DNA sequence: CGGGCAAGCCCG
DNA sequence: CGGGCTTGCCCG
DNA sequence: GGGCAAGCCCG
DNA sequence: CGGGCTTGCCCG
C-alpha cells in the first residue's frame, strides 16, 4: 500500500550492494553509467546487466525487485508505464509474456514475474534471488527498459529513478538501492554533457 | 475517388484565403503565400477564410481533408499518431472522433467523415453565407498532431483539401495548400522561406 | 444563429456611424478614447456616452445591440461575460435591473433589453432607436461595462471587440461598427501607453 | 474560535522540515529557513518532511489548517477566492472541495474537514510511518491560491498548522511556518530576505 | 489627480 | 532563469 | 526570441 | 562511431 515508493539507499542486515560493471566508452553505446552522478544511461530496448552483491546469504525464498519512479515531486505520484507508442506496436511486445504497459523488463529469467499492485497501480518486476555462482562475487541481473526517456504520452522527457529492493516473501524490505535512470539514443554523448554540465559548475 | 488535389474555382469561384497574422516564431500559427503552406500550432485555432463569386446551393457544404503531398505516401490515410489518439489532452471533449488530424471549433453542425471502404477521414460543416456585410467566410480548424509526429505523420508532408460539395457529393470547388503542424510556426516558415532561396 | 459574429464595420443604407465626444485625458478618466486606435478605455460600472448617427432615420421598432467578443481567434469562441467574482458579487448587483452575468448594461433607458440566445449562449443588450434627442447630431446610449479586461476567471487580460448593431425589429442587420475595448482601472494612463508604444511601428 | 498555532514537539520529537530547493525566480516552491517561510508557487506540488523517534498512536492521523498571521484577521477563515473556487481550472477532476485551500496530492486516505460550527477548513490524512530505510513521512501538499488573491486572503500573509492528532483530535504535536503563496517564489523569497537586515 | 509599488506574467 | 512589462490599488 | 535538448540521419 | 541537424521545449 505504499504510494510513493521510498528511493532512499538502505543496505540493511545483508549489507546489499548494486554496482555496474562492464563500460563501454562510446557516444551511442548500448548502455554506460556515471558513478558520479549515480546516473545510468541506456538505448531503448537494450540489454544491461546490473550487478548484485550480498556478504551473507538471505533468508530463503527472498527476491529482487525492480521498480521506476520519476525523480520530481510533481510527477511522484504518476505512475511510470510506457508510452502508448511503443505499448501498442508489435516490436517486443509480439509473444512476450511481459505486459505490454511495463517499462521494465527482466531478460533471461523466466521465473521473472510482472507485478501491477491492484490498489497503488504501481508496475515492478521481481525475481527470486539467486546466490552468484561458485567463481563469481555478483548475482548478475540482465534488464530491458522499454521506453526512452524522451517517449511523449508516456515518461515525456521527465527523469526516472529506478529502485532495486531486496525482498521478504511477503515484500517486507531487507535492502534497497537507488539511482537516477536515463532512456537515451545515445548514452555516452548525454552522459558527457551531463557529466560537464557538473565540471562546470 | 481517392483522393483528388488539383484546384478547381468552379461555377461560384471558389477561393482559400489567409488574413494576415504574426511573423512570432510561435505564433499560434501563420501563412506563406511564397510556399503555399500553412504553418500552425498544433490544437490552436487556425482560421481560414472561404470566399464564393455567387450564393451556393441550399444543401452545400465545405469539407477538409489531409492527404500526404509525396507519391509515395498518398496511398496511406493521414490520422492522428497514437499518443496523441490515446494521450487525454484533447480528446476530453466530447465532440469529435480522437483519431481525426482535422477538427473543426465552433460550429456544431460538424460532420466527422469516416469513408466506410477507401478509409479516408475528413470533417464537413455546412456551407453559411458570409455575414452581412461581409466578404469572407470563416472556418476555425484545428490540427492534433504535429507534422513531426512518430507512428503518424512521421515527419511527412501533407496538403489540406477544401472542397465545397453538394449534398448529393458533387465536387463544385476545390482548393488545396500544404499543411505543417508545428511547435514554432514562424521558424519554420522563416526557415523555410530561407531555403526556398537556397 | 451566428457563433462568430463578424466584427467589419457595415455603414448601412442609413449611413450608420458610431462616435466618441471629447474624452477627459487623465491618467484614470471615468473613460477615454483612442480614435487613433478605434479602441476605447472604460472604467469598470461607469457611464460610458456613445455617440450614434444616421443619415436617413430607419423603420419604427428598429434598435441598437451591443455585443462583446474577443479580439483573437484563439479566443473568438469563448462567450464573453462576467467573471465569477464580480457575477456572484454582492459588491455591484443590489439595485440589480440587469442579469450578474452579462458584461454590457444600458444606463437611463428601461427598454433596455438583455438578450441571452439560448441557441448561441451569446450575451447582448438591445434598446430600441431614439432619433436624436431634440436638436442633437447624435443619439446619446449610456453603457456600462461590469469587468476589467483583466478580470481572473472571466475574461482575464485578453482583448475585447465591443459590437453595436443597427439592427431591424426581428433580426436583420442594417449597419455594423465595432471597436477595441479595455475596461481598466487608469483609462488614461493605459491609452498614453498604447498609443506612445504604437509610435514606432 | 482560534486554533492554537502555538507549537509544541510533545511526546514524539515531532518535527517538520523542508528538503533542499531550487532558487529560481519562478520555482514551483523555496524555503527559506531564515524566516519560518514558506514559498509557494499556486497549486504546485509541495513535499513536507515529518519525522518522529517514537510513533505508536494508532488512529492517529495529521491535518493541515490554514490561518491568517496578523491577528485582526485571525478570526477571519481562510477559505479560497471566489474566483478560483468558481472557476473550471483545478476543479473538475479531483475528489476534493473547491473551496479549500489547501489539498493533499498523493492520497486517497485523505479527508477534508468542514468545521460544523467554527466553519474552519482543513485537511486530515492518518499518519504513515516512514517507509524502512527512511527518515520521514512525506506528506504532498498543494495551495490552492495565491496569496495576493483578493476575495481570498486579500495581499494578507498566514501560517500552516500541521497538527499532529489522536483520533479523538488530541494535539499530540505541532509545528507551524508562515506560507506565501506566489508566481515566483525565489524573487519574492530573495527579495524578502534582503528587506530583513534592518 | 498623478506618482509609486506589489505581484502576476510575458517575452526574449 | 532572469529581467523587465504589466496593473490594480494605495498614498498623499 | 534565442538556445538548448535529443532522436536519428549521414558519411 | 561521431558530427550534425531538425524539431520540441525551456531557459549560462
Ligand atoms: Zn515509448
Ligand atoms: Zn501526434
Ligand atoms: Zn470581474
Ligand atoms: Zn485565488
Same mark, same amino acid.
Given at each position: +500500500?505504499?504510494?510513493?515508493?521510498?528511493?532512499?539507499?538502505?543496505?540493511? !542486515? +545483508? +549489507?546489499?550492494?548494486?554496482?555496474?560493471?562492464?563500460?563501454? *566508452?562510446?557516444?551511442?553505446?548500448?548502455?554506460?553509467?556515471?558513478?558520479?552522478?549515480?546516473?545510468?544511461?541506456?538505448?531503448? =530496448?537494450?540489454?544491461? !546487466? @546490473?550487478?548484485?552483491?550480498?556478504?551473507?546469504?538471505?533468508?530463503?525464498?527472498?527476491?529482487?525487485? =525492480?521498480?521506476?519512479?520519476?525523480?520530481?515531486?510533481?510527477?511522484?505520484?504518476?505512475?511510470?508505464? #510506457?508510452? !502508448?507508442?511503443?505499448?501498442?506496436?508489435?516490436?517486443?511486445?509480439?509473444?512476450?509474456? =511481459?505486459?505490454?504497459? &511495463?517499462?521494465?523488463?527482466?531478460?533471461?529469467?523466466?521465473?521473472?514475474?510482472?507485478?501491477?499492485?491492484?490498489? *497503488?497501480? #504501481?508496475?515492478?518486476?521481481?525475481?527470486?534471488?539467486? !546466490?552468484?555462482?561458485?567463481? *563469481?562475487?555478483?548475482? *548478475?541481473?540482465?534488464?530491458?527498459?522499454?521506453?526512452?526517456?524522451?517517449?511523449?504520452?508516456?515518461?515525456?522527457?521527465?527523469?526516472?529513478?529506478?529502485?532495486?529492493?531486496?525482498?521478504?516473501?511477503?515484500?517486507?524490505?531487507?535492502?534497497?538501492?537507488?539511482?537516477?535512470?536515463? @532512456?537515451?539514443?545515445?548514452?555516452?554523448?548525454? #552522459?558527457?554533457?551531463?557529466?560537464? &554540465?557538473? #565540471?562546470?559548475?
Amino acid at each position: +500500500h505504499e504510494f510513493i515508493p521510498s528511493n532512499t539507499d538502505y543496505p540493511g !542486515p +545483508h +549489507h546489499f550492494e548494486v554496482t555496474f560493471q562492464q563500460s563501454s *566508452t562510446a557516444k551511442s553505446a548500448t548502455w554506460t553509467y556515471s558513478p558520479l552522478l549515480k546516473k545510468l544511461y541506456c538505448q531503448i =530496448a537494450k540489454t544491461c !546487466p @546490473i550487478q548484485i552483491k550480498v556478504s551473507t546469504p538471505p533468508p530463503p525464498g527472498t527476491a529482487i525487485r =525492480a521498480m521506476p519512479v520519476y525523480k520530481k515531486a510533481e510527477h511522484v505520484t504518476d505512475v511510470v508505464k #510506457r508510452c !502508448p507508442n511503443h505499448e501498442l506496436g508489435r516490436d517486443f511486445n509480439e509473444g512476450q509474456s =511481459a505486459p505490454a504497459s &511495463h517499462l521494465i523488463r527482466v531478460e533471461g529469467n523466466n521465473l521473472s514475474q510482472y507485478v501491477d499492485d491492484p490498489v *497503488t497501480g #504501481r508496475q515492478s518486476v521481481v525475481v527470486p534471488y539467486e !546466490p552468484p555462482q561458485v567463481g *563469481t562475487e555478483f548475482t *548478475t541481473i540482465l534488464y530491458n527498459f522499454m521506453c526512452n526517456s524522451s517517449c511523449v504520452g508516456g515518461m515525456n522527457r521527465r527523469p526516472i529513478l529506478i529502485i532495486i529492493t531486496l525482498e521478504m516473501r511477503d515484500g517486507q524490505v531487507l535492502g534497497r538501492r537507488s539511482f537516477e535512470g536515463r @532512456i537515451c539514443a545515445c548514452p555516452g554523448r548525454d #552522459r558527457k554533457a551531463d557529466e560537464d &554540465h557538473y #565540471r562546470e559548475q
